[PDB]
Amino acid sequence: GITYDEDRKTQLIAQYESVREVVNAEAKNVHSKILLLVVSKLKPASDIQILYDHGVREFGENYVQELIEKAKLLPDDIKWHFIGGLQTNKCKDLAKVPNLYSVETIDSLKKAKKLNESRAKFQPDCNPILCNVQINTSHEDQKSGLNNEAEIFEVIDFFLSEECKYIKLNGLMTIGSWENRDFATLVEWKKKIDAKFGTSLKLSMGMSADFREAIRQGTAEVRIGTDIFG
Ligand SMILES: *Cc1c(COP(=O)(O)O)cnc(C)c1O
Numbered sequence: 740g741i742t743y744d745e746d747r748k749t750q751l752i753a754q755y756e757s758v759r760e761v762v763n764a765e766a767k768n769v770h771s772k773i774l775l776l777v778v779s780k781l782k783p784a785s786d787i788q789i790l791y792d793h794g795v796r797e798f799g800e801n802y803v804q805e806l807i808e809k810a811k812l813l814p815d816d817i818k819w820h821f822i823g824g825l826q827t828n829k830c831k832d833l834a835k836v837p838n839l840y841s842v843e844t845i846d847s848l849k850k851a852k853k854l855n856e857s858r859a860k861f862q863p864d865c866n867p868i869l870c871n872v873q874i875n876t877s878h879e880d881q882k883s884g885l886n887n888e889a890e891i892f893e894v895i896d897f898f899l900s901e902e903c904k905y906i907k908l909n910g911l912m913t914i915g916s917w918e919n920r921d922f923a924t925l926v927e928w929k930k931k932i933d934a935k936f937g938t939s940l941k942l943s944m945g946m947s948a949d950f951r952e953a954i955r956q957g958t959a960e961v962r963i964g965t966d967i968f969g
Pocket residue numbers: 778780801822823914946947948962963964965966
């Protein structure tokens with residue numbers, strides 16, 4: 740497939756395994772496996788091939804066109820996770836990727852309906868896209884994420900409806916803020932929702948600077964790039 744240098748291979752795998760060892764060590768230190776989503780945004784496809792060949796399957800991309808271009812160049816069994824800003828007009832585009840495993844940035848009912856809509860038309864055959872609801876856990880104003888309980892509840896209601904058959908509600912997601920109060924707020928959102936809808940939501944929180952704490956607060960998935968591709 741994509742050709743890569745041997746010195747970079749040895750270095751990428753080393754840095755990755757070291758990140759994965761700390762994630763596993765942190766997890767094993769609590770009261771069962773956490774996903775290490777490898778955020779390859781802006782990284783070349785050769786780097787992904789390096790890790791792919793190493794056994795890695797789940798990579799996170801933030802840009803729609805980049806993910807699509809990347810998906811066509813690399814193996815079909817990669818489990819792409821779209822973790823960037825989602826515009827309703829790009830849903831149709833994303834839905835076309837067969838191996839689009841997950842979309843963690845659904846932050847409106849309009850978007851959920853459009854992705855489910857698009858997925859039905861272009862890849863009804865393919866497995867339902869696993870989805871996370873992005874919530875603004877910061878107590879500040881943030882360009883993305885939901886903060887309104889009524890609107891959040893309305894998004895969850897649709898996911899559990901019979902009409903939503905091509906995208907599956909998996910959990911909650913947050914970019915945090917800039918002990919962790921943000922992860923704490925996400926944890927509280929999962930309880931209020933699990934209680935009201937009878938769900939057992941999966942949490943996606945924790946990045947390069949705070950994945951350890953996220954791991955301590957119950958995360959089911961951490962998204963790390965910098966620590967792995969440096
Ligand atoms: C880029 C990004 C990450 C990862 O942070 P790193 O310092 O690169 O580990 C995780 N989640 C989202 C939504 C991102 O934009």
